Structure 1
Amino acid sequence: SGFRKMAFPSGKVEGCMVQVTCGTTTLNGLWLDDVVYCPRHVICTSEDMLNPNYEDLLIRKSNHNFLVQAGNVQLRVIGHSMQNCVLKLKVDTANPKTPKYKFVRIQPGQTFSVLACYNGSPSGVYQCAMRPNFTIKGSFLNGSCGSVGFNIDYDCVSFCYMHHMELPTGVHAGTDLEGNFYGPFVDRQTAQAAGTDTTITVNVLAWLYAAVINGDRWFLNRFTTTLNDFNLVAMKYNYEPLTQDHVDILGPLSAQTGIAVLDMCASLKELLQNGMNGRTILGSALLEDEFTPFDVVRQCSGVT
């Protein structure tokens, strides 16, 4: 028993981290096969950051302007190109530690592990949820840019995120591995803010199931509700609307505990109106929304 915010083992990703230098700017890169991926803002200076022309800045830059460091070994850049907001550096040698991988674009509410790096060296790992406003509440200091987010399916690593910048409120913004931003952000040094965040409702429900599986059952009641009744209450408290897709996804948890999703929604509806009244759930005084139903099943219902 027990329940923790668990990250995927990072070993397959650690062997892909490199340091990328251009001028007085050092950030992290992802070395897969003979290509190194990093944020395109590495070619920028303090001047060409307020209004940068990346198209103009890349044509004047040459291969020798990129210092790629894989641990102690130096990698010779034999080409470069841009794909949206990511820079692709073609290198002379293929990464022997390249795992089985794929580039995936995740949806808000989904979770992933982040390997936080500084100068190409992995220093920490933590579990994340993509917020409904398209930001991530991570922990990043300067030099973390180009740190990646991933999920492990079986032997296949799926890269879903690359860090680009921090927003003034402390939240973080980035792209998928094809350079497409998550959210209405630009990779320019300008005033930009995230939209209003909302609670990922289906994730809170999965967590209430994990609590029931671990012996915390005080919030259960005899009552049931409907999707229409629940959503009207949820929208008032800044919660994501619950769809029938969300209900079907909670199925294996509903079957294993003996508490139907609509039965559990009445407990959640009761917690939103009345509060937690001095009590905790899984050692938390706030409703947790950074565990998906799959995370709960993988951690509890199954060994892996």
Structure 2
Amino acid sequence: SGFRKMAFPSGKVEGCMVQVTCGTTTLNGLWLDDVVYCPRHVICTSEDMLNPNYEDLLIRKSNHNFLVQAGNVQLRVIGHSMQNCVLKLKVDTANPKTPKYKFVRIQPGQTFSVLACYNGSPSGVYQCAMRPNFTIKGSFLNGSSGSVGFNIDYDCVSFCYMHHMELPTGVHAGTDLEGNFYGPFVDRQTAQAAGTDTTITVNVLAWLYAAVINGDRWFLNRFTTTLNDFNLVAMKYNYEPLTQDHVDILGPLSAQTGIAVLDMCASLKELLQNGMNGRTILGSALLEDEFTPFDVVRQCSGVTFQ
């Protein structure tokens, strides 16, 4: 039993993390076979990043401008490929450490593991969820640009996030591995703001289903509610709309706890309408929303009585 934010074993990603240096800019790259992917803002100088002509800047650079460092050994950049907001540096030797690998694009609510990296080496691994405003609440410092987000199913690594930049609010924004940003962000130093952060409702409901498993009962009520009646309350408190697909996903928790999904929605509808505060759910006085229902089901010790 026990509920803990878990990240995937980082081993298969660590074998792909390298250091990429252009000028005085040093950031991380993902080394897959004979290609290295890194953010394309590595080719910018200190004062290039305010209104950058990225196509023009790429003309200005040659192969020798890119210093790729694979662990303890230097790699020769023998050509550079680039797509949208990522570079792809060709190296002379294919990565023998390359895993079963696959490029995906997640949508908000979904969770991926981050391997925070600096100078090509891993600092730590933690779990992140894609906020509805398309930012992640990660832990990154200057030089972390290039750390990747991933999931592991069977033995295939699903790459979904490459870290680029940090917004002023403290959240972080990046691109998927084909170079396309999540949300409206662009890799230039201009007037940018994180969108209105919104509470992931389906993840809040799974959190509430998990508390019932450890025994919190004070928020439950007799009442039921329709899907539309919930969403009407969901606007007012920045809660993402609850789609019919979300309902199907909470089903396993519905079956085990004996509480219908629309019975929780009424219990949550009532919490939002009061601001019930001071009371604790799973020991905390706030609604936590970065467990997907899958995390709860996998980490619940389970057993349903049908």
Report the TM-score, using the length of structure 1 for normalisation.
0.96
CA–CA distance in structure 2, aligned partners of residues 77 and 122 of structure 1: 23
User: Residues 72 and 231 from structure 1, CA distance in 2 versus in 1: closer, same or farther, beyond 3 angstroms?
Assistant: same
C-alpha distance after superposition, 1:238-283 (max 9, x if no partner) = 1111111111111111112111100111111121122334221112
By how many angstroms is 1:60 displaced? 2.3
Shift of 1:234: 1.2
In structure 2, what is the Cα distance between the partners aligned to 1:276 and 1:32? 50
Q: How far did residue 101 of structure 1 move?
A: 1.0
User: CA 1:95–1:61 in 2, change beyond 3 Å: closer, same or farther?
Assistant: same
| Distance change >3 Å, CA 165–CA 284, structure 1 → 2 | same
- The superposition leaves residues 170-203 of structure 1 with CA deviations (integer Å, 9 ceiling, x where unpaired) of 1111100000000111111112101111111011
CA deviation vs aligned residue, 1:52-103 (integer Å, no higher than 9, x gap): 1111111221111111111111111111021000000011111111111100
- In 2, distance between residues paired with 1:33 and 1:268? 49
User: What secondary structure does 1:273 align onto?
Assistant: helix
Shift of 1:303: 12
**Residue 303 and residue 217 in structure 1: after superposition, are their counterparts in 2 closer, same or farther (change >3 A)?**
closer
Instruction: Give the Cα–Cα distance (whole angstroms) in 2 for the partners of residues 157 and 303 of structure 1.
Output: 30
Shift in alpha-carbon separation, 1:302–1:103, aligned structure 2, 3 A: farther
With 275-284 and 3-12 compared, the bigger mean Cα shift is at 275-284
Shift of 1:34: 0.9
Stretch of structure 1 that moved more, 32-41 or 222-231:
222-231
Distance in 2 of aligned mates of 1:65 and 1:301 = 54
Structure 2 unmatched runs, 5+: none
Q: Does 1:231 align with 2:234?
A: no
- Whether the 8 Å contact between 1:3 and 1:282 is mirrored in structure 2 is no
TM-fit CA distance, 1:223: 1.6
Q: Runs (4+) of structure 1 moved beyond 3 Å?
A: 301-304
Aligned counterparts of 1:126 and 1:303: Cα–Cα separation in 2 = 28
1:205 CA displacement: 0.5
Shift of 1:20: 0.3
Whether the 8 Å contact between 2:50 and 2:190 is mirrored in structure 1 is yes
- State whether residues 256 and 302 of structure 2, in contact with CA within 8 Å, keep that contact through their aligned partners in structure 1: no
Residues 159 and 302 of structure 1: is their aligned pair in 2 closer, same or farther, counting only changes over 3 Å? farther
Matched-pair contact (CA < 8 Å) for 2:112–2:127: yes
C-alpha distance in 1 between matches for 2:86 and 2:104: 15
The C-alpha deviation readout for 1:124-155, integer Å capped at 9, x for no partner, is 11111111111111111111101111111121
Greater alpha carbon shift after TM alignment, 247-256 vs 35-44: 247-256
Confirm or deny: 8 A CA contact 1:118 1:144 kept in the other structure: yes
Question: Would the aligned equivalents of 2:277 and 2:285 in 1 still touch at CA under 8 Å?
Answer: no
* Structure 1 segments unaligned to the other structure (5+ residues): none
Query: Residues 2 and 299 of structure 2 are in contact (CA less than 8 Å); yes or no, is this contact kept in structure 1?
Result: no
How many residue pairs were aligned?
304
Distance in 1, Cα, partners of 2:303 & 2:180: 35
Q: Which residue of 1 aligns with 2:164?
A: 164
CA-based RMSD of the aligned residues comes to 1.7
Residue 47 (structure 1) shift = 2.5
The question of whether the paired residues in 1 share the 8 Å contact of 2:256 and 2:303 is answered with no
Q: Take 2:75 and 2:261, find their aligned partners in 1: how far apart are those partners?
A: 54
Q: Whole-Å Cα distance in 2 between the matches of residues 11 and 302 of structure 1?
A: 29
